[PDB]
Ligand binder design. Structure first.
Ligand SMILES: Cc1csc(CNC(=O)c2ccn[nH]2)n1
Length: 435
């Protein structure tokens, strides 16, 4: 009760204080065979996280670690296998029976307790993002079974509060995915969740639109900029997993970008988000057109939309801010692959009017960015900025393989930058072997 409480408090301390377990998940996995009963005392954990002390209170850093450890135990119980990296997977009768009973316990428990957790820690972005990994493990049918409607209402209230308070990409994305899970995974509560979502979206589209209008009519305030960016971020996050096409967001994104090319003075983060949002609008237009039975004019309206957006990305390669060039580059390399001739696979030859061959000018600019921003002369931030340039080249590599860009001009650039490997590498290789 408090006995298991002590063991959990010290388990959190051994985790943080020793560098003997770097990954929470790997710690839990390793103790799992021997300490399952303890590691699934979820009532004990939420009690620690929600109660006020008598004495000795938990420190902000230890609270964080307990939430992270709790969520790993919730996964390991639900999935009934070691985490990604410690795998090898056939369950016994009793292992299977235990998994069902565990999923039951943590669903009933966290439906009640997850809104109370999100309420208390609502401003801690890292913590809220971690709590919102929990619903994916819910046995969602139980939101009906337990006459538990009052607690679905409570989670939706708390997700609303979080999204309204936060702009961090991890938080919002966590909110987006939770709605997705809550919505399309059980018909019983699908209708209730859909009404909460679209009211949330509605309130953010109105605020976005009023702020776009404010910015563009204006001299332009710091408030005008905050208001656009803050609302655009929430909508960009959600527009990946949710079809927000019914709200014409591409329209205002398009103006923001046109204004930031013309007068060249649009803040870098607005341009990046405005690009990402426009992209997600187009992908969702594409899906409705693939699955629908679309007319000639449907195709030609989406085409005009796509050619104007490829134009905007091409122009945005010339933006001073390298985060914009990167975003524009990434989108060019997705779109040029998606609206290639691949689009006429699986008997979908109706889509030919949607096919786009990049011109020489554009191909040459997609070559430039690689020389300027992939292949550059000169801690943790650099292993990360390397993986990005890797992804940027890999996204560009696909265009080379299918001759969407000039495959020869490309390999010339790869000659120029590999020269020292081809001129001195054998000599460097054998030298390093003999030390
Ligand atoms: C037909 C075609 C495709 S691109 C091209 C000429 N551009 C380049 O080769 C290049 C290298 C660096 N920047 N641009 N010709």
């Amino acid at each position: 009760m408090s006995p298991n409480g002590n063991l959990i408090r010290m388990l959190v301390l051994f985790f943080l204080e020793s560098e003997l377990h770097e990954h929470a998940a790997y710690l839990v996995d390793s103790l799992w065979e021997s300490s399952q009963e303890l590691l699934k005392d979820w009532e004990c954990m939420t009690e620690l996280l929600l109660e006020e002390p008598v004495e000795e209170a938990m420190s902000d850093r230890q609270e964080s670690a307990l939430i992270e450890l709790m969520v790993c135990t919730i996964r390991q119980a639900a999935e009934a296998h070691p985490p990604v990296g410690r795998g090898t997977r056939v369950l016994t009768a009793k292992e299977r029976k235990t998994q069902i009973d565990d999923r039951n316990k943590l669903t009933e428990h966290f439906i009640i307790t997850l809104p109370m957790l999100l309420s208390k820690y609502s401003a801690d972005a890292e913590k809220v993002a971690n709590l919102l990994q929990i619903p994916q493990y819910f046995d969602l049918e139980i939101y009906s079974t337990g006459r538990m409607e009052k607690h679905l209402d409570a989670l939706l209230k708390q997700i609303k509060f979080v999204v309204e308070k936060h702009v961090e990409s991890d938080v919002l994305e966590a909110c987006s995915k939770t709605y997705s899970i809550l919505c399309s995974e059980e018909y019983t509560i699908q209708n209730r969740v859909d009404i909460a979502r679209s009211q949330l979206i509605d309130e953010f589209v109105d605020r976005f639109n009023h702020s776009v209008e404010d910015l563009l009519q204006e001299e332009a305030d710091d408030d005008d900029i905050y208001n656009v960016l803050s609302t655009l971020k929430r909508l960009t996050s959600f527009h990946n997993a949710h079809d927000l096409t019914k709200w014409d967001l591409f329209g205002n994104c398009y103006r923001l970008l046109k204004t930031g090319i013309e007068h060249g003075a649009m803040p870098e983060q607005i341009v990046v988000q405005a690009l990402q949002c426009s992209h997600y609008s187009i992908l969702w237009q594409l899906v409705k057109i693939t699955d629908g039975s679309p007319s000639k004019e449907d195709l030609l309206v989406l085409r005009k939309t796509v050619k104007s957006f490829l134009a905007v990305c091409q122009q945005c390669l010339s933006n001073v801010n390298t985060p914009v060039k990167e975003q524009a580059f990434m989108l060019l390399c997705d779109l040029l692959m998606i609206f290639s001739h691949q689009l006429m696979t699986g008997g979908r030859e109706g889509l030919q009017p949607l096919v786009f061959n990049p011109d020489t000018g554009l191909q040459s600019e997609l070559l430039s960015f690689v020389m300027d921003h992939v292949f550059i002369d000169q801690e943790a931030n650099k292993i990360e900025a390397l993986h990005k340039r890797r992804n940027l080249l890999a996204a560009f590599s696909k265009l080379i393989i299918y001759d969407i860009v000039d495959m020869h001009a490309a390999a010339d650039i790869f000659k120029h930058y590999m020269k020292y490997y081809n001129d001195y590498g054998d000599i460097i290789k054998e030298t390093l072997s003999k030390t």
